Write a protein that binds this ligand. Structure first.
Ligand SMILES: NC1=NC(=O)C2=N[C@H]3C(S)=C(S)[C@@H](COP(=O)(O)OP(=O)(O)OC[C@H]4O[C@@H](n5cnc6c(=O)[nH]c(N)nc65)[C@H](O)[C@@H]4O)O[C@H]3NC2=N1
Ligand SMILES: NC1=NC(=O)C2=N[C@H]3C(S)=C(S)[C@@H](COP(=O)(O)OP(=O)(O)OC[C@H]4O[C@@H](n5cnc6c(=O)[nH]c(N)nc65)[C@H](O)[C@@H]4O)O[C@H]3NC2=N1
Length: 766
């Protein structure tokens, strides 16, 4: 039994593991990590927690009756343990059956999810690689993060923008006078990376602070970002940012402050937006006063913020919560319009950036090569959050970015690396729609709500039980890490690659799936390709064994630290045009105009959302800020020792303002029921003035624990906030999710005592 230390990586960062007698006993942060995440101790625990999945299992009803099984009991925990050969045979037959009876349109393989980093052990790509050899599948398009903004940005600035490099942090420290964080909490969200994180935002934030730059935070909650800087804190009613923006815009026009030359030379359509802004088209001048009526931010503050932004070198750094909402396309389009008026786009330290809060955006990029991994070998496509509408309406038409298509008639869904029974909106509607699927197959290493609702569950390994390779730094490209195997696979878990190879072998496509390569065979070909490309560029890299032995290769920064977004566009717009039809920033879009969608007009517009705090005729009184957890990565690590540090009487915490608690007779630590017309959950309250009055904070990612899966509307005992959200599209343009457009009521829970069952394994899988 192994004794020693191994260096690996994860979504939380690079770390070294201490191994004693074959068991991992500690995870220590990399010595070069400038700001490790306290969640690493849950990462270690997730390998061994009580919800680790030990063996392959098949739902008793599915085993007994297949397609005639009662599908309303999915999630009741009545599983049967089976051997691997039996489950592999059954998965293979099911894939074959659905592909022959129904075609590629009967298999949903979008399998949305955060999985784990790794260029070889890429479970979602491997799933698509297997399914492509089986005949095809329906896929997902977009994501739950920027569903609206990633569609609107290309119409407005000609590129995706949300996942592109930002003006380097050092440039901001030298040049920015006012830094605005709009619906962004960089301190909280920069702990993680899509590939391994370098945590580059922390030194970037430290440098602004050290320089005395003025920092403003626009957020309903007083976050760690406000506290870190002692920032001026503006607290709007959630979903009213566009109103605020329009009032600022109005003020710049009324007081004649805006940059008319920038407007004239770098933008298109302002002259079509001005009438709206001034109130000629609807009789409603969008003044600061008007904006105060909707958002509750004082008129005078709105004009003061406007005047300050125009006279100082200002960076508008915006988060994505505000577009994860009804009409969410308007938030970033109005933000770019406002930035246009200020006219600082393309100057060092000015303009706007849409990725300073995620994966190190702004961290100076190196000049190293890109690393690539296994590939998938490749309506057939749906916007990802329309999964439930698809299941309910096979054959119906839907709009998406100017086109019309029809929903495929899906009969099977195969999910790996994701938790839709946590991440998707309107849990009760979803639980009923899932009955439309004949077979539901899932691989995970933790017994999440999704695993609990499968017909067939296959235990996967973590990254700590195998070898892989991955880049460090989604934007920085700081280096390449060897993700070395720390302990052996636990119980009967197997890597996703191994399971898929065995299924492909049973479909008679084994060789095509593996390409005749084993684990190290694949990893070395990704490395050799990256070294070959590096040599071409003049970056020297060791040979593979030398690399593997050191465990990491770092790259040099040459001019990456001088990067300024949009500089060449500002420098000469004709020579360096945007990808838009006019080549300019499009305030009014003729392209959007021609689609003629009522919920997405051709210029940024204030529109009432489905439900909003203090909106006319609103039924519920509190906005739920259903934002990202501080101490989880979505649902990951919920079933670990970290839960004990935030849970209130065992439930997911609910933050509530002293006055809202006082009005309902609630005291700190009480168990309360949060409910609206879509569902009802239990949470434990923390009374704090960190949330503005009218707002409550329930993070997304809580593990759904239904009291009874056969009872429609059954009470969730843990606190999955997606039990209360609605499942609707941002608009016909993007069809994004509206996960944070949520109102509810809260009362002291006075029903029967409840026993939590989500943090232990189903009895048969013990
Ligand atoms: N109401 C609401 N508000 C929101 O802000 C919100 N945010 C959304 C966002 S932006 C997104 S990205 C989604 C994220 O939702 P997503 O389903 O991506 O969530 P995770 O909790 O990261 O689930 C990933 C699963 O993969 C499993 N897993 C990890 N590694 C492996 C592996 O190698 N193999 C296998 N088989 N499994 C693995 C993990 O154990 C975990 O259960 O939530 C969305 N949902 C949201 N809802
Ligand atoms: N620790 C951590 N856990 C995670 O799960 C996690 N998820 C990652 C993922 S996949 C992504 S996509 C990003 C998400 O990055 P994103 O910016 O979408 O994060 P949120 O936590 O949903 O919201 C950020 C802030 O917006 C505020 N806010 C909410 N509604 C409004 C509003 O109407 N107006 C204004 N002005 N502010 C509002 C919230 O209070 C919150 O502080 O984070 C990434 N980083 C993450 N870090």
């Amino acid at each position: 039994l192994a004794n020693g230390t191994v260096m690996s990586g994860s979504h939380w960062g690079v770390f070294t593991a201490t191994v004693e007698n074959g068991r991992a006993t500690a995870f220590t942060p990399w010595e070069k990590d400038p700001h490790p995440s306290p969640m690493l101790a849950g990462v270690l625990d997730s390998i061994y927690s009580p919800t680790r999945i030990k063996y392959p299992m098949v739902r008793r009803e599915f085993l007994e009756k297949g397609v005639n099984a009662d599908r309303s009991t999915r999630g009741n925990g009545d599983f049967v343990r089976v051997s691997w050969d039996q489950a592999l045979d059954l998965v293979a037959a099911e894939v074959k059956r659905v592909e022959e009876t129904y075609g590629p349109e009967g298999v949903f393989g979008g399998s949305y999810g955060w999985k784990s980093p790794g260029r070889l052990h890429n479970c979602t790509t491997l799933l698509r690689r297997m399914l492509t050899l089986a005949g095809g599948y329906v896929n997902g398009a977009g994501d739950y993060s920027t569903g609206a903004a990633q569609v609107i940005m290309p119409h407005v600035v000609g590129t995706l923008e949300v996942y592109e490099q930002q003006t380097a942090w050092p440039v901001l420290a030298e040049n920015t006078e006012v830094m605005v964080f709009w619906a962004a909490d960089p301190i909280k969200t920069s702990q993680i990376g899509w590939v391994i994180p370098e945590h580059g935002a922390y030194p970037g934030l430290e440098a602004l602070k050290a320089k005395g730059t003025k920092v403003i935070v626009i957020d309903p909650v007083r976050t760690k970002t406000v506290e870190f800087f002692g920032a001026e804190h503006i607290t709007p009613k959630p979903q009213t940012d566009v109103a605020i923006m329009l009032g600022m815009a109005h003020t710049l026009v009324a007081e004649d402050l805006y940059d008319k030359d920038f407007i004239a030379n770098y933008t298109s359509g302002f002259d079509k937006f001005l009438p709206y802004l001034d109130g000629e088209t609807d009789s409603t001048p969008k003044t600061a006063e008007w904006a105060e009526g909707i958002s509750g931010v004082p008129a005078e503050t709105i004009k003061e913020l406007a005047r300050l932004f125009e006279s100082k070198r200002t960076m508008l750094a915006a988060g994505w919560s505000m577009q994860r909402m009804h009409h969410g396309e308007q938030a970033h389009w109005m933000l770019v319009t406002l930035a246009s008026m200020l006219g600082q786009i393309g100057l060092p330290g000015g303009g706007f950036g849409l990725s300073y809060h995620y994966s190190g955006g702004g961290t100076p990029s190196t000049s190293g090569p890109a690393l690539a991994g296994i590939t998938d070998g490749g309506a057939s496509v749906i916007p990802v959050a329309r999964v439930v509408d698809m299941l309910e309406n096979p054959g119906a038409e839907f709009d998406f970015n100017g086109t019309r298509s029809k929903f495929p008639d899906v009969k099977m869904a195969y999910w790996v690396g994701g938790n839709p029974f946590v991440h998707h909106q309107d849990r009760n509607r979803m639980v009923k729609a899932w009955e439309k699927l004949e077979t539901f197959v899932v691989h995970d290493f933790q017994w999440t709500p999704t695993a609990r609702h499968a017909d067939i569950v296959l235990p996967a390994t973590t990254s700590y039980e195998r070898n892989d390779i991955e880049t460090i730094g989604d934007y920085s490209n700081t280096g390449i890490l060897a993700m070395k195997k720390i302990v052996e696979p636990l119980y009967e878990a197997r890597s996703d690659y191994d399971i898929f190879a065995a299924v492909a072998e049973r479909l008679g496509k084994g060789a095509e799936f593996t390409e005749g390569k084993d684990e190290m065979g694949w990893i070395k070909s990704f490395y050799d390709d990256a070294a070959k490309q590096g040599k071409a560029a003049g970056v020297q890299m060791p040979a593979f064994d030398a690399f593997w032995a050191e465990g990491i290769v770092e790259f040099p920064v040459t001019d990456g630290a001088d990067f300024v977004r949009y500089a060449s566009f500002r420098e000469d717009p004709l020579l360096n045009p945007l990808g838009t039809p006019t080549g300019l920033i499009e305030i009014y879009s003729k392209n959007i105009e021609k689609m003629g969608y009522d919920d997405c007009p051709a210029h940024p517009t204030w529109m009432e959302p489905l439900e909003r705090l203090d909106g006319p005729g609103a039924k519920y009184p509190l906005h739920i800020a259903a934002s990202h957890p501080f101490n989880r990565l979505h649902s990951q690590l919920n079933g670990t020792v970290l839960r004990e540090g935030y849970a209130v009487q065992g439930h997911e915490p609910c933050l509530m303002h002293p006055d809202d608690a006082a009005a309902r007779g609630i005291a700190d630590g009480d168990v309360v029921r949060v409910h609206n017309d879509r569902g009802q959950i239990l949470t434990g309250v923390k009374v704090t003035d960190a949330v503005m009055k009218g707002v409550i904070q329930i993070y997304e990612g809580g593990w759904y624990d239904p009291s009874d899966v056969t009872e429609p509307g059954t009470l969730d005992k843990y606190g999955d906030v997606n039990v209360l959200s609605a499942d609707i599209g941002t608009s016909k343009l993007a069809q994004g999710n509206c996960g944070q457009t949520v109102l509810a009521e809260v009362e002291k829970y006075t029903g029967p005592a409840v026993t939590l069952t989500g943090f232990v394994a189903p009895k048969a899988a013990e």
